[PDB]
Each structure stands twice: as C-alpha cells, then as structure tokens.
Amino acid sequence: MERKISRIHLVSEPSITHFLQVSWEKTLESGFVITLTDGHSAWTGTVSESEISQEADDMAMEKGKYVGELRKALLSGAGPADVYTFNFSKESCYFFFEKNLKDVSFRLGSFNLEKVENPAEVIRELICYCLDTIAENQAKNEHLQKENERLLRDWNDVQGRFEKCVSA
C-alpha cells in the first residue's frame, strides 16, 4: 500500500499550499486514491484502471507514457523543466491537472472529488504516517551509520596488519 504526500499550489488560491496524498496498492496503473487537504477541509476521490484507460484512449497515446506523466505530476517527480498547474473547483469539487508548455496547455487529467464529513480523522492519519516514516528513516540512518563506522574501524585495522605483514 504505497503512499506519497506532495505539496501543491492551486491557481485559485496561490497564497496557501494544499497537500495531495496519493495511495496505490501495487502500481499507479491499477488505480489510486487521492486526497486533497488544506488543514481545515479534505476531499477524497478514487481513480480505477478503467478511468485511466479511458483517459489514455481519449488523449490517444500509450498507457505507459500517460502513467509516466501521471507519476511526474501527482507524485512530484517532475524534471528540471516541467510545469504542472492544478485547478480545483470547490463548489463543484472538480480537481484537474494540466501540463503547461510555453503558450499551450494540455488537460492531463480530471477527477470529481467528494468532501469527507471528518477532515480531522484524515489529517491525523496523515500526520501519524509522516511521523512513523520519519522515525523509521531515522532508525535506518542510525543503523547504517553504525555499520559504516564499524566497517571503517575494521578496514583501518586490516590496513595496519597488511602494512606490517608486507615488510615481514
């Protein structure tokens, strides 16, 4: 159940940053659940394989390229020169994202999100997941540092032993 949290700036409200959480089971192709929050309200939607296939067919391109573009846009995997614009109509709860290219734009995708009666629960879940991953990464880094220190010490000792033996 892979998850990814990214920060975006909607054109409608550029003075604040929204958080987009995308969760998928195995791969983005199969489907994913997205959640857009701003600290006070949350909107959750789901996209299935059928919707992705229909969008790819409508845009008339291979599924792989569309999946790659979706990964670059939603998961914040953009390259050195790649601008993506996210629009969200709150009154209609319609969230779409497009790729900006000079003076032209491509409507990369669109979904119809729905409000959740308890944004607090999802906010707390997101914060708890962030804290858990932070702790896990810190523990892994500490273990790796310990291993590196041990390896360095052993390497130095073996180097000294070799220095003695070469002259012996």
């Binding site: 391109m61 790649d82 290219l101 000079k102 003076d103 032209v104 491509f106 409507r107």
Partner: protein, 228 residues
C-alpha cells in the same frame, strides 16, 4: 495579411517530403496570422491558405485537450515543419500521411511535444490554374532560359581558352605532361554527344528529389526577379 502569406509562399523553395513509401514536393510559409501550403506529386497540385480563426477551430477539434491560441499553435507547427523540410536524416519526430478522398488531399502530421501527442491536418484542394502556373511553369521556363544563357557563356569561355591554348601550340613549346592534351570544343558536337549519351539520365526527374537537390537557388532567384 492575406497577401503577405501569398508573397511568402511564392518566395519559398520546394522541399522533399517522405511519407508511407511515397514522395511529395512541399512549399510552406507559416506566420502568426495563418499559413500557406502547396503540395505536388508531379501529377497534381494542391493548395491551402489558412487563417487564425480556422486554425483554432480545427485545432480544438483535432486536439480536444489542447488549450492554445492560434499564434502559439502556428509557431509550434512551423518549428516542427521547417527542420524537416530544410533537410532529411535528422531527428524527425513527426510522421506524415497523405490521402485522397475525391479531389482534395488530406495531409495528417502527428508528432509529440514534451511527450504529448499533437495532430494537424491540411485539407488542401486542387490548386487553381493561375497559382500552379505562377508557381511552377513560369519559374521553370525562366530557369531553363537562364541555364541556356549560362551554357552560352560557358561555350564562349571555352572558345577563348581554346584560342589561348592554340596560341601556345602554334608559338611556344610542348607540354611536359602529354596526358593533359584537350580536344577543341565544338558546340554542335558536344550537344550531339550529350543528347545521344547522357540525356536519358540527365532528364530523369524521378520522384522530384533531383529537382530539389540540384537547382533550388536558381528557382528562388527567378521567382524573386518575377516578383520585382
């Protein structure tokens, strides 16, 4: 506005186009206010002049998700087309396909910009007799006349060089390299030899490639002179 497109198309050279094991000769002039295209296959000629409004109308229907102004679309199309027309054997990211329905040629170009698809179709109807004449017949006759004048100048220069060589031969010495001896140049004999030996290959238009590769500067100069 409209006249500028016609003048630009007239002042443009022919380019070779390859598509689905087929060849075409294309002249394209694209500006922010529209474009003009003329495509020939040595048997028929099709022409298309297009303005910004129709560009937007066709683009919004071909690329549903593309939100672009006519100027940007035209600039992108020009940047995509000019490199291919200028020369071949380059990173051609565009695929071309031509089809005839009843009397008009539909030329579809499909490419990718920033990895996203981009389509454009030229619906070029048969060119009018005046346009075809002005673009092919008169320039070709002018080029032929200019080449004949060049041949006459070359013959005169050869005659002068032969006179100098004869001066040396009659009053002078012998060449150290006997292999360099050259026969006197006779216009009638040279023309006869050319006609019976190399005319069949020289006059082989083929699919239009030799016309583009060999003489295009002369065509441009003749067209410019005709304009003035």
């Amino acid at each position: 506005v409209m006249e500028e497109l016609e003048q630009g198309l007239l002042m443009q050279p022919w380019a070779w186009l390859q598509l689905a094991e087929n060849s075409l000769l294309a002249k394209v002039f694209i500006t922010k206010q529209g474009y003009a295209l003329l495509v020939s296959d040595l048997q028929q000629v099709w022409h298309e002049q297009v303005d910004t409004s129709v560009v937007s109308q066709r683009a919004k229907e071909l690329n549903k998700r593309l939100t672009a102004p006519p100027a940007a679309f035209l600039c992108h199309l020009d940047n995509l087309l000019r490199p291919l027309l200028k020369d071949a054997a380059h990173p051609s990211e565009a695929t071309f396909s031509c089809d005839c329905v009843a009397d008009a040629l539909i030329l579809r170009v499909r490419s990718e910009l920033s990895g996203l698809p981009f389509y454009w179709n030229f619906h070029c109807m048969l060119a009018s007799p005046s346009l075809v004449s002005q673009h092919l017949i008169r320039p070709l006759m002018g080029m032929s006349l200019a080449l004949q004048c060049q041949v006459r100048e070359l013959a005169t220069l050869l005659h002068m060089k032969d006179l100098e060589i004869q001066d040396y031969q009659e009053s002078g010495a012998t060449l150290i390299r006997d292999r360099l001896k050259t026969e006197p140049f006779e216009e009638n004999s040279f023309l006869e030899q050319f006609m019976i030996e190399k005319l069949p290959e020289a006059c082989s238009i083929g699919d239009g490639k030799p016309f583009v590769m060999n003489l295009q500067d002369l065509y441009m100069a003749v067209t410019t002179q005709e304009v003035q």
